[PDB]
Structure formats: C-alpha cells, structure tokens
Design a protein around this ligand. Structure first.
Ligand SMILES: Nc1ncnc2c1ncn2[C@@H]1O[C@H](COP(=O)(O)OP(=O)(O)OP(=O)(O)O)[C@@H](O)[C@H]1O
Ligand SMILES: [Cl-]
Ligand SMILES: [Mg+2]
Length: 263
C-alpha cells in the first residue's frame, strides 16, 4: 500500500539545489511552486541495495503519516534520493547550538517529540525508530517538531550516546520500544543543557563500559525560570535512561507527563 502513493521524481523537476545536510538539499520544485528536501545517497555507484533501502525508508515514513512525523513525497532516480517536506528551521541539533532557547519552547519540543514517538509505538505492529537523536528531529518555520530519518526503523561518532546499555551488554539483542525510550532520555538531556552528550570525554570506550554499569550524562542544575517543570523533566529523563529496560516508562506514560509540562 505504501509504494503506491509515492511518486518518481526526475531531476529536471528541481532547481536551486542548496546544501542543508550534515547529503541533503533544499530544492525548488518548479511546477509546484514550492520547496522540498531531497536526501541523496553518498555512494559513488547507484547500488541496488541502497535503491531498495531508500524505498523502504520512504515506505515506512508513509505508513506513519502523522502531524509529528515528516511527510514524504517519493523518490528520485536520476540522482538516487528520497524526496520529502522541507523544514525551514532544520534540525534540533543545529537549533541547540545556535542560541539559548526559551524554556516553554524546550518543553514543547520535548512533548511534540514524545507525541510522535508514541504514534510510532501505537502502530500495529509497533514501529521502532532506533535512530532518535537531535539531528533527526526537524523543526518547521514555527518551531514545531517533525521526526525524520527512518533508515534504521524496523516493523518487527554521535550514535554511542543514544545507544541503550543493553545493546552494549548483549551481542545481538532483540530491538524493542525501550531502545527508543533510552534515546529520548538523551534527547531530553540535550534540550535541558543545549550541549552534545559526552562531547568533553575523550575515551569513548571507557564511557561505554561505565554506561553498562549505570553511568549517564551529568545532571543539569535546576533552572531559574521554570524550576518546577525543569525538576519534573530531569526526573522523567532519569527514569527514561534506567539501566533496566523494563523499568523505563512507555511513551504512553511519558506523553501524559510532558503534556503537563506545557502549561
Ligand atoms: N526535510 C528536511 N528539511 C530540512 N533539513 C533536513 C531535512 N531532512 C534532513 N535535513 C537536514 O539534513 C540532515 C541529514 O539528516 P538525515 O537523517 O535526513 O540523513 P542521514 O542522516 O544522512 O541518513 P541515513 O541515516 O539514512 O544515512 C539533518 O540532520 C538536517 O540537518
Ligand atoms: Cl515551573
Ligand atoms: Mg540522520
């Protein structure tokens, strides 16, 4: 059902190719008189593993069409690329590095992210994102969230930070919803601090092992402008990164809590 509504694009349809990635381009679609985004494959050869995986990525984005999930329009062949809605503000990662953000916006970003993740986990069967980090949380012109980057999702280096400890303890464990919950904990931490996690520490491997034994990013202090809400968010964050997956809350329980923070 997913591959049906998608379109094949041709590069002549696009103009004004302008790098936004980190490769991703903002392109004008001339006939539609609107801008779109296209994520082009890095590889030198137009490989058949990729062309099917980019389709998978697109197909999974269409299955989770929702307010807080990036819309997807289809595929380009001429350059192999995934075609999708353009988000004017860009990534959360970029926003956290740009300037201090008002607290009420921080709580809204967190909530909206939680709402979208809840939507994925409520599908039948659940859809695990497995790559939730600020670089894949996109923000529209009005700073509303749309989750993106479904390359690793399953219907069954920055990344070590977002990796759950059970994924380091066990070779080849079954992916579950509790993976996404841990990663979300590390997303909250970044929103609280506006820092990248472990950006100080040099021995990546040493930190890995410490994490297996319950070590996490340093807790931020309670902020002056919204100390009640901030304390509540820090507390939620901590339950979300618990070492035991089964103790971590569900996104159903999380969204209930983050909604109260937005008042
Ligand atoms: N729709 C979009 N609108 C605007 N900027 C985008 C969009 N999609 C991605 N970007 C930007 O480009 C970056 C590329 O991220 P994206 O996850 O899409 O590609 P990727 O990480 O290379 O993918 P993959 O994991 O499949 O190799 C984002 O972090 C963001 O800064
Ligand atoms: Cl408060
Ligand atoms: Mg990405």
């Amino acid at each position: 059902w997913a591959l049906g509504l998608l379109r094949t694009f041709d590069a002549g349809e696009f103009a004004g190719w302008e790098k936004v990635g980190s490769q991703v381009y903002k392109v004008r679609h001339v006939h539609w008189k609107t801008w779109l985004a296209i994520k082009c494959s890095p590889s030198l050869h137009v490989d058949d593993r990729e062309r099917m995986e980019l389709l998978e990525e697109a197909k999974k984005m269409e299955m989770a069409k929702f307010r807080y999930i990036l819309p997807v329009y289809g595929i380009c062949q001429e350059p192999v690329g995934l075609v999708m809605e353009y988000m004017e503000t860009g990534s959360l990662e970029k926003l956290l590095a740009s300037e201090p953000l008002p607290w009420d916006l921080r709580f809204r970003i967190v909530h909206e992210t939680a709402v979208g993740m809840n939507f994925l986990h409520c599908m039948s069967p659940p859809l695990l994102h497995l790559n939730l980090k600020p670089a894949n949380i996109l923000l529209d012109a009005h700073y509303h969230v749309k989750i993106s980057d479904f390359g690793l999702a399953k219907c069954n280096f920055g990344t070590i930070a977002y990796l759950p400890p059970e994924r380091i303890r066990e070779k080849s464990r079954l992916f579950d919803t509790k993976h996404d919950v841990y990663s979300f904990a590390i997303v909250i931490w970044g929103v609280l601090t506006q820092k990248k996690p472990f950006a100080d520490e040099k021995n990546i491997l040493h930190i890995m092992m410490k994490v297996v034994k319950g070590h996490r990013p340093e807790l931020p202090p309670i902020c002056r402008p919204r100390p009640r809400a901030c304390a509540s968010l820090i507390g939620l964050m901590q339950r979300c990164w618990h070492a035991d997956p089964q103790v971590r809350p569900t996104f159903q329980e999380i969204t209930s809590e983050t909604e109260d923070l937005c008042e």
